[PDB]
């Protein structure tokens, strides 16, 4: 309304406002010092407050884009430091904002962040809490200029939570370090998802994006009408389209809007939104997005009678098109939370192909009469990979599963860097631990999640790059995972002679290097050296001497060279 800054200050609260303002500026003006950003934020904050006090006061009626750009253009160094960004200041809105978006440099090429010693950190923390956090918030933001600021701020609050707890402890390190890793991990993942989703929307187009979204929202809100699910799909697609284009202010208004709508109609979407919708506004969009699947309504009628049996299937296909198809996906999805989204899409694609062929035929009804049987193999295929790998993980346990996987994939693609190999396989085994703990019903959605993050990591690794995996990485996200599972051994390295998990990683690095130089040797032979190696190290760590490691290792090398060839 009037004083919308006033509206956003009052909605966010002063502290969250200040944090977000900082992040926003940090992201555009990446090469400005900390002390300057703080002053910019304090200027904005003090102004904000005047508008709250009186909505009628000078400039309070401006939009947030005007006030934002105005503030950027006050900057003294703006031409010296950022060059053309200064030319944006000559333009009126909304061209000005646009012009500023262009000049956000994704890779600031600034020094990579050194984690200090936990002592020094916790002191910095205790000396000035605010400065310490803000500083880190600043440093992260200016390196990730495309990170939804509210999301950044959420991590920031868990950083603070970590410090407040782990620092008052006998081992700051025992408590603080895992959390810091976990957070940095989660954030890097979060980014990866966002980036993927945008690449896909651009690459595969809006339609594909909407298909995917219909599937996911139908599972999530199965008590919602087809017409409501379609509404939500539309709005979500616009928010994603907006957000990808990189404007924080529009992105956030559209997320706020979508959240607000969903909460106004909760009763018609999900029982599960009750608490989400009492959450403070920065929290609510984020909370809704991670809400659990609702119960699917009891005794829903058969999918087949509307699509397999009822007349007008080709009339409605031909009249409604994507809506008819959209409805199929919706109706299949809401009845099948046990499925991964990519599966539901494969099914949908199959039905749609069936209809293209059949509705072109003399007797369509005959030709599509038994389409549902075409689903049976598509559904069984992932179901069985789950069962089979889950049992092997249950038999073997995380560590040695990772090594079972380590062999499998070095054999299938030995060209790839073993580090990448060690890390992919290690992750996959963690995926296994994550997923097989769930009820079989909840495994396949769980897998699809944790695989997509792993498979993507691998795929973005292949930028500085093995020819075969590019096909899989440049497929539709639907058929990525099956294209990968379709790998077989390459079939077509010299011998160099040259601590908990880190020791394990070294052992694995060795295992891959063994399988490299020697791809051919069987699995009994791998088992042998693995055991003789387990025996060598236990022997020499136990021995009082370094000499034992030296003499045994030549013996172990020689012993296994013989047992090779």
């Amino acid at each position, epitope marked *: 309304h009037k004083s919308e800054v006033a509206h956003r200050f009052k909605d966010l609260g002063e502290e969250n406002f200040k944090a977000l303002v900082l992040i926003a500026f940090a992201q555009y003006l990446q090469q400005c010092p900390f002390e300057d950003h703080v002053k910019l934020v304090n200027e904005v904050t003090e102004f904000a407050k005047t508008c709250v006090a009186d909505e009628s006061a000078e400039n309070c009626d401006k939009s947030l884009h005007t006030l934002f750009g105005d503030k950027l253009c006050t900057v003294a160094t703006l031409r010296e430091t950022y060059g053309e960004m200064a030319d944006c200041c000559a333009k009126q809105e909304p061209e000005r904002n646009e012009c500023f978006l262009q000049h956000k440099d994704d890779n600031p090429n600034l020094p990579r962040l050194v984690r200090p010693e936990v002592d020094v950190m916790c002191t910095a923390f205790h000396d000035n809490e605010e400065t310490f956090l803000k500083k880190y918030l600043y440093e992260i933001a200016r390196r990730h200029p495309y990170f939804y600021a509210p999301e950044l701020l959420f991590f920031a609050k868990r950083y603070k939570a970590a410090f407040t707890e782990c620092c008052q402890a006998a081992d700051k390190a025992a408590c603080l370090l895992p959390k810091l890793d976990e957070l940095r991990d989660e954030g890097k993942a979060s980014s990866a998802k966002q980036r993927l989703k945008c690449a896909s929307l651009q690459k595969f187009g809006e339609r594909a994006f909407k298909a995917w979204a219909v599937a996911r929202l139908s599972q999530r809100f199965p008590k919602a009408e087809f017409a409501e699910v379609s509404k939500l799909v539309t709005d979500l697609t616009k928010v994603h389209t907006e957000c990808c284009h990189g404007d924080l202010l529009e992105c956030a208004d559209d997320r706020a809007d979508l959240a607000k709508y969903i909460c*106004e109609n909760q*009763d*018609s979407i999900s029982s599960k939104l009750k608490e989400c919708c009492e959450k403070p506004l920065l929290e609510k969009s984020h909370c809704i997005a991670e809400v659990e699947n609702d119960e699917m309504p009891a005794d829903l009628p058969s999918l087949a009678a509307d699509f397999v049996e009822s007349k007008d299937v080709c009339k409605n296909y031909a009249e409604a098109k994507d809506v008819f198809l959209g409805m199929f996906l919706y109706e299949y999805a809401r009845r099948h939370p046990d499925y991964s989204v990519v599966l539901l899409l494969r099914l949908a694609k199959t039905y749609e192909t069936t209809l293209e062929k059949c509705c072109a035929a003399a007797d369509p009804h005959e030709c599509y009469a038994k389409v549902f049987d075409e689903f049976k193999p598509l559904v069984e295929e992932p179901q069985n990979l789950i069962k089979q790998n889950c049992e092997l993980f249950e038999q073997l346990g995380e560590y040695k599963f990772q090594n079972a996987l380590l062999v499998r994939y070095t054999k299938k693609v030995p060209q790839v860097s073993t580090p990448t190999l060690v890390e992919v396989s290690r992750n996959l085994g963690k995926v296994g631990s994550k997923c097989c703990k769930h009820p079989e019903a909840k495994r396949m959605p769980c897998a699809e999640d944790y695989l997509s993050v792993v498979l993507n990591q691998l795929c973005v690794l292949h930028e500085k790059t093995s020819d075969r995996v590019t096909k899989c990485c440049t497929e539709s996200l639907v058929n990525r995972r099956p294209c990968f599972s379709a790998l077989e051994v390459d079939e077509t390295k010299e011998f160099n002679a040259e601590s908990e998990k880190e020791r394990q990683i070294k052992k694995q690095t060795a295992l891959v290097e063994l399988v490299k130089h020697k791809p051919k040797a069987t699995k009994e032979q791998l088992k042998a050296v693995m055991d003789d190696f387990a025996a060598f190290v236990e022997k020499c760590c136990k021995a009082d001497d370094e000499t034992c490691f030296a003499e045994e290792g030549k013996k172990l090398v020689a012993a296994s060279q013989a047992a090779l060839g």
Partner: nanobody
Amino acid sequence: EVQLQESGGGLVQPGGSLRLSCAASGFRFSSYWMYWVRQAPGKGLEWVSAINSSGGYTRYADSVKGRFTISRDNAKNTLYLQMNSLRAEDTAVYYCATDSGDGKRYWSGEYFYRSRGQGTLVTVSS
């Protein structure tokens, strides 16, 4: 059993007004999207407009945009359609429809529906 009953139809001059009402029962009206469809003499069914479960989310066919205002009163299970700036070509039978389910589906040209009423005749001429 879904039950709809339209009313308020009748004859008006070009550029006149009407207010169609529709009485719902047999389903939880307040939790479902409601539509207005129409069929001109000799023509196919047209989608006219749509409203969400709560209200405050309305859509309109291009032709009627700016002219007709759909709304609902959930307290009364009544769907309204306020027809202003009427035209000769707006002469048709106006049904109200819903997708309350477990039933056969039909295409209105923007939304599938499941049940519609008897209709109300609107004539616009002279």
